[PDB]
Amino acid sequence: KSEVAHRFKDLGEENFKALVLIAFAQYLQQCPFEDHVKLVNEVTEFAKTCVADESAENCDKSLHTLFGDKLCTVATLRETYGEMADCCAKQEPERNECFLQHKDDNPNLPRLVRPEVDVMCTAFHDNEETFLKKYLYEIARRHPYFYAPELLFFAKRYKAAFTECCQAADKAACLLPKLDELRDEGKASSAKQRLKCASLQKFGERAFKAWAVARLSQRFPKAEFAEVSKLVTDLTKVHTECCHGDLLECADDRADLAKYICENQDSISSKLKECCEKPLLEKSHCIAEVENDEMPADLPSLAADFVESKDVCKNYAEAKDVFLGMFLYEYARRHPDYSVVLLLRLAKTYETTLEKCCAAADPHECYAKVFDEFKPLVEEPQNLIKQNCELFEQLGEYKFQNALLVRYTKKVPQVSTPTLVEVSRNLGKVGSKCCKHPEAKRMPCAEDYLSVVLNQLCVLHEKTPVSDRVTKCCTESLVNRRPCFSALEVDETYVPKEFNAETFTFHADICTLSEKERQIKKQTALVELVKHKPKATKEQLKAVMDDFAAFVEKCCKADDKETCFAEEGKKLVAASQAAL
Known part of the structure; x- marks a missing residue:
């Protein structure tokens, strides 16, 4: 039997074309479109001919082996420059890995461009544009791991949009606000995912x-x-x-x-x-x-004292895997009000402990209300979402979400300035999309979401390796991530402590260069880190800064591009570090 046509014989053909593109284009992710598409066109072909006939020559490829052996070819030798130090070696197993399956990650390579103001509305004489080309984009870019079928689900919801409102609204309004929301939701899952793999292998x-x-x-x-x-x-x-x-x-x-x-x-x-x-x-x-x-559950199922007030320490616990599984699951059942990432910690203070004392020198009290020393590791969340969800509440949506910057930029002041400001605001965005939501329903979202972001942080920066600490809280545990970064004071480790860095304030009539505070603030905020990285930390001081760099606008007119550039540099570096 074959693989190729067989896959063809369920997911049909569009969605075969539809996978095998994203496939080939997370994979090599810098080579231009048509190279990729010729190669699809061909896979797409062939398939039909083992459709005709399993028995035909070379159907007998083990799927990959095709790609592997029709990928390196004219995709790659037209692609000759220096990072993929070719990887089609002794026709192997060890192909997929060494390079074809090595995806540069977040920050991959060229990117800035995209569609724009008016023109992308283009279901007239091609969907090769937009619809199709939401994969050499919404899946070459920064998403080599993005989950295939969900892109096929997020394909129609780029298609279907166009496929109604280029119409009366010149695409203007009736269209592109389904192109505001569903862009964060592209990042969201593509990032709510790198996790599910990061768990995986x-x-x-x-x-x-x-x-x-x-x-x-x-x-x-x-x-x-x-x-x-x-x-x-x-x-x-x-x-x-x-x-x-x-x-x-x-x-x-x-x-x-x-x-x-x-x-x-x-x-x-x-x-x-x-x-x-x-x-x-x-x-x-x-x-x-x-x-x-x-919610709420199966049952009454009253109480969980099979894991407890009993004597089957080991006796009913020589199934390692399923014992824990039935702790977890049954603990899991009655707790929509606790986050998985927490409960997974309660599923490692059973496992350890019960091994701490199914062994030696009885009796039972060892595991006697673990329920009553778990409780440290069930308070810290229930608590933390205070100085999450108050510093924000009556103290700032998009204003001081750049508090968690100040926190992180301090306690871990060597991650890349962007790679702070991607997280800094992102794990910012918990305050918004969860405090305003409270109850139980709060925490399941908000240890978890936070948990994803820290992973973006980890997966981002192996690439260049920086804070041996960040090295430590990523590696040492998945499950202990978000009391790790947290349980970290200002790493007074610092020095380098760069002084005075004027590839600094690019000013440049940023003031309406750029629009939407998402674009305005982000720079105004991108000021923050590098205004401390000189002087690691200070008390009151550092807001006589970001107004001395909030005039960064209002000296930006009447014959500009040199107004705020001479001025600041005295009046924002002069105002800097050690005196003011």
Whole structure:
């Protein structure tokens, strides 16, 4: 039998063209469009001829082996410059990896450009433009890991948009505010994902199970332990693939799944009616995270004292894996009000401890209310979301979200100025999209979201390696990430302590060079870090700065581009470090 045409024989053809492009274009990610597309055109071909006939010569390729051996070819030797030190070696296994499966990450390479003001409205005489070319863009750029089928789901929702409102609104208004929102949602999942791989095989594959047995049980909390373990065992497989390189199996798989999940509906989690009256595609992004859990649970199931007031320390605990699984899951069930990332810590203070004392010198009290020394590691969140959600509350949406900069730029003052200001504001954006939301529903979002961002931080910067600390809180644990960065004072380690850096204040009539405070502030904020990186930290001082660099606007007119550039440099560096 073959692989090629067989994949062709489920996900149809558009979505075969539709994968094999993004596939080939996360992969090599700098080579121009047509090179990539000729090569698709050809895969796309061929497939049809093992469609005709399995038995035809060389169908017998193991999928990759085609790509591998029709990729290096004229994609690559037209692509001759110096980072992919070719990787088609002794026709191997060790192809996918060494280079074809090495995706430069966040910050990959050229990028600045895009579409613009009026013209991108272009479902007239090509969707090769926009619709198609939301992959040499919305998937070459900064997303070599982005989850295939979800791009096919986020493809229609670039298409469908155009496919109504170029219309009466000149595309103007009735269009591009579905091109505001759904750009953060491109970043969101593409970033809500690098995690799910980072769990997967930049960290042990075993972890993920515990991730998802924690999670699918937080939403399907009557799903018997049987059935979460044919949803998280079935989801690893998917996610592993979309991570390990080979998508296609993926996209087929989340219906080789959803057409189990959603034929079984009632034995699993009631609330997946809606998205089962939804064309495949959108099934897997209702069920995918917009899944209002069916709290509260299975049961009364009164209490969880099988893990507790008993004597089966080991006796009923010679299944390592499933014992923990049934802690996790059953603990998971009654706690939509605690974040997975937390509960995963309670699932390592069972596991350790119960091993601390299933062994020696009885008796039971060792594990006697672990429930009552867990409780440190259940207070710090419940608490932290105070000096998350108050410094923000009555003290600033987009004003002092640049507090968490001051915090981070201090305690960890060697990550790259951007790579602060991507995070600094991003993990900023928890204050907004979660405090204004409170209850239980608060924390599950907000240790978790924070948890994603710290990962952006980690995955971002291996590339150049900086703060041995950041090295430490990334590596040492996944599960202990967000009391790590947190549990870090000002690393007085510093010096270099750069003085006086005038590839500094580019001024340049920024004031209406640039618009939308998202663009205005970001610079005004991009001032912050480098106004401390000289002088690591100071008390009151440092806001007599960002107004002495908020005149950065109002000396910017009447014959400018040299107004605020002589002026500042005296009056913002003169105003700097050690005296003022």
